[PDB]
Write a protein that binds this ligand. Sequence first.
Ligand code: PRO
Ligand code: PRO
Length: 581
Amino acid sequence: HKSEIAHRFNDLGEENFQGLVLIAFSQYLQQCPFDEHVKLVKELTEFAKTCVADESHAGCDKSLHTLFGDELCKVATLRETYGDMADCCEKQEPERNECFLKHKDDSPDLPKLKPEPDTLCAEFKADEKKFWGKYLYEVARRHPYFYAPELLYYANKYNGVFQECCQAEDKGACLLPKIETMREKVLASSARQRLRCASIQKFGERALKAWSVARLSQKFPKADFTDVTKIVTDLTKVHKECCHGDLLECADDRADLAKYICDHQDTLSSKLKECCDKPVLEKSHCIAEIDKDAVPENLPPLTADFAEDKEVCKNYQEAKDVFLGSFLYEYSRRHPEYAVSVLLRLAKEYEATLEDCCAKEDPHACYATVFDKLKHLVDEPQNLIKKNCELFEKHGEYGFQNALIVRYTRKAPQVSTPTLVEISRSLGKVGTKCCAKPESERMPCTEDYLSLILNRLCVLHEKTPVSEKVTKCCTESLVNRRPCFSDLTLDETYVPKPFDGESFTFHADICTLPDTEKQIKKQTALVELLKHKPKATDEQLKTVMENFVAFVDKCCAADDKEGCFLLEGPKLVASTQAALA
Ligand code: PRO
Ligand code: PRO
């Protein structure tokens, strides 16, 4: 189209248009305040509108990378706030856009948000619009790769929370669960996009194509390899656009593809029609989290075409990727009960087998027992799952998190305490999310969550790396990632660097803090505990813990509280090191 900025503006409409641009500024300039971004955003909103009314106008044919970038440039505090990011502005497109993206901070250390029901309802009634885009600021800046069309849907679900709720009699009781459920779903969607972008970047497009193949085949097991491949081809393009910070394109192509899929409903899945009349964003979200359709009844056994045919090697040498793309679709549309990562890992084994049989005298011999060999690859990861859930059953989440602290602290004690804690506290939650569903959802569940939390870890680590073992697992095949991390053992090499003089001691804030912060506080002790003596007994650990709990209990029940903590504090530091040797 002859003016892009305005091509897009009619394409999306003033609201989602302004959404998207604010998301783009807030992911560029994570540290600039929200009124700053509110301005940069109406200037390009005005200018856009101009290119709607006089398309030949001065500057309308420009690209968005020059248009956006042109405004990052009139943010005078780029040195102060982002260092050499202001050097970015000096450069020409496409380098200035190359450079701005570098400065994306995956771990921005801004204040966690404590939702206060009366302040938020007051903010909401006072300014609906500013409230909405405030939610877009907050999430987007803490989550610089958040899926932009998806963000806009959640801002919409968010404000509609403050719509149902601020009204009601007990405001808090109405708000607080709903915004907490929504907060979990948001974080989840944030990790999954973050997984996509780090796949595109550390591992090549194709690698991501496999994921969308097996996952999309599981959802629409009644559609073509052709058809599937077609969507996966537009999906990949959307997803690429976002991660590159081309949000407008992104949402627009996600719009088209959703049209497209809703157009081909029966060819794909009975389920689509539910989704197919909701407006663009509720439509796009519904389709993406859409239910697994059921496999058609009379499909032939995988064994014919991949294990008994005698043209299996020939096929496999003429068109490897195709044959293995087709195996992946074929295997996938058939086992909705398997973790996407597991399938790929099955795909890979199948491959390495053919790579070995197809060179024998009798390949058909060597390879006709493949699917059996593959049925057993699933049962060991199942082993871990179930063991990890029992552990969670007998201990409950907080207990289970503390076991994961212990384990993983030992694996990688050079990793930072915040990271071991966040990572360990989320591995705890998977216990809650998954352990209870019927197994036909369980394994996908657990492995879904695993992949997102490991990829979280990997993204923090590559920012400031401190474990070779860690960098390895992060940096080989995604498909081997949980394996590698599950196989890690204590760094028999790590020194108990003392972390001494700097000591970890409590104060009376723990009395007042919401239950999770107390946990974080305690867990950070657990970690630093282990960092200082990596060999320490399970029971050793367990008694030391039983004491902090005694210690805070006594001290949160005293009338003067910090006074207690300043008094009996030292004696826990003595009590503990002798416990330790
Ligand atoms: O929220 C809205 O709908 C207004 C109109 C477009 C930009 N903001
Ligand atoms: O997209 C992929 O290929 C990786 C491997 C399994 C999990 N996801």
